[PDB]
Amino acid sequence: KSACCDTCLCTKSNPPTCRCVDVGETCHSACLSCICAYSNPPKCQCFDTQKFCYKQCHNSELEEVIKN
Amino acid sequence: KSACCDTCLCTKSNPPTCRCVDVGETCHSACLSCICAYSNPPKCQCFDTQKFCYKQCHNSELEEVIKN
Amino acid sequence: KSACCDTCLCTKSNPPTCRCVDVGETCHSACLSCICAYSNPPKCQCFDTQKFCYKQCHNSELEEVIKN
Amino acid sequence: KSACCDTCLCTKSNPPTCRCVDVGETCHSACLSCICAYSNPPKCQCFDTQKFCYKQCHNSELEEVIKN
Numbered sequence: 001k002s003a004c005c006d007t008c009l010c011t012k013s014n015p016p017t018c019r020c021v022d023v024g025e026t027c028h029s030a031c032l033s034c035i036c037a038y039s040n041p042p043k044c045q046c047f048d049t050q051k052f053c054y055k056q057c058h059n060s061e062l063e064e065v066i067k068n
Numbered sequence: 069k070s071a072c073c074d075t076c077l078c079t080k081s082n083p084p085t086c087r088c089v090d091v092g093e094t095c096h097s098a099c100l101s102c103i104c105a106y107s108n109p110p111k112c113q114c115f116d117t118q119k120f121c122y123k124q125c126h127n128s129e130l131e132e133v134i135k136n
Numbered sequence: 137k138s139a140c141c142d143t144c145l146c147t148k149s150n151p152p153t154c155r156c157v158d159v160g161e162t163c164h165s166a167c168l169s170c171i172c173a174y175s176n177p178p179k180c181q182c183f184d185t186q187k188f189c190y191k192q193c194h195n196s197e198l199e200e201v202i203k204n
Numbered sequence: 205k206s207a208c209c210d211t212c213l214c215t216k217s218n219p220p221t222c223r224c225v226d227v228g229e230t231c232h233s234a235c236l237s238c239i240c241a242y243s244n245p246p247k248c249q250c251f252d253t254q255k256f257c258y259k260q261c262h263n264s265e266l267e268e269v270i271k272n
Contacts, residue, residue, distance in 0.1 A: 001188070002144075002188065002189045002190065002191050002272040003139070003188050003189070003190050003191065004191040005136065007077070007133060008133065008134045008136045008138075009075070009089065009131045009132070009133060009134070010131065010132060010134045011130055011131050011132075012129070012130065012131070012132060018134070021077065021089050023087075023115075029187075029188035029189075030166075030186070030188060030190075033105055035103055035104075035105050036103075037101055037103050037115045039101075043115055045103075045113065045115075047105045047111060047113075050166070051165075052137070052138065052139050052165035052166060053134050053136035053138045053139070053165075054136065054138065054139050054166075054190070054191065055136055055138050055139065055140040055190065055191035055192070055193070056136055056191070057191070061080065061133075061135070062079060062080065063077050063078065063079050063080070063133070064077070064078065064080060064133065065075060065076065065077060065129075065131075065132065065133050066076045066077070066078045066086070066121050067129070068073060068076045068121035068122065068123060068124055136138040141272065143213070143269060144269065144270045144272045145211070145225065145267045145268070145269060145270070146267065146268060146270045147266055147267050147268075148265070148266065148267070148268060154270070157213065157225050159223075159251075169241055171239055171240075171241050172239075173237055173239050173251045175237075179251055181239075181249065181251075183241045183247060183249075189270050189272035190272065191272055192272055197216065197269075197271070198215060198216065199213050199214065199215050199216070199269070200213070200214065200216060200269065201211060201212065201213060201265075201267075201268065201269050202212045202213070202214045202222070202257050203265070204209060204212045204257035204258065204259060204260055
């Protein structure tokens with residue numbers, strides 16, 4: 001399909017370092033390192049880091065960072 | 069105590085489902101499912117999901133969600 | 137910004153090979169090989185090829201292939 | 205004759221602006237601005253823009269626009 005990321009997390013650093021924390025049965029098409037948990041159905045996340053964010057998949061903020 | 073979380077992600081749903089996306093050589097003390105990548109040094113993240121956020125570790129925000 | 141591509145071209149092959157043919161003052165954030173013409177303003181295109189398409193930038197088909 | 209184009213891209217605008225996105229060790233005969241990447245073998249594309257499409261070279265479609 002198309003490389004996209006719903007929840008992109010970047011550090012406040014400069015240059016910032018970014019990653020995609022989306023979780024699912026698979027990782028987005030551009031993911032080099034896709035790590036999954038051994039459960040059914042599987043749970044996978046892309047562990048790659050880059051200096052940029054992929055475009056959203058749905059353009060709908062499904063998650064937010066709670067200042068705990 | 070030792071179970072703490074810097075970056076807590078919760079869905080906007082109701083009830084919301086949450087998880088700790090912190091990465092490191094290990095996971096926090098309360099983590100049931102700690103998944104790591106096989107690189108040196110290791111990169112691990114806690115795949116657990118709960119309806120709440122643990123307390124911050126260093127009360128500092130090292131990451132932010134980029135509205136991509 | 138965010139790695140996106142408005143016009144992704146893929147061969148009919150299998151596996152297909154894809155590229156982004158968007159042209160502008162610069163290339164998208166994920167471009168390794170960005171080639172520009174020496175005019176003012178510049179005209180650049182990303183010459184990278186991958187087995188996937190980046191997500192659209194505007195989700196509005198601005199170009200179409202004319203069967204000449 | 206020798207100036208031919210397999211993949212002609214035109215905007216949906218009016219009047220539409222067109223270009224030939226064919227890639228190769230060289231550009232078609234009618235190309236004014238032929239831009240290449242510095243790899244072996246070379247990769248060149250004609251950056252020219254016109255309000256029309258040249259005729260096909262092999263009347264075959266080797267590429268398609270993927271609605272990403």
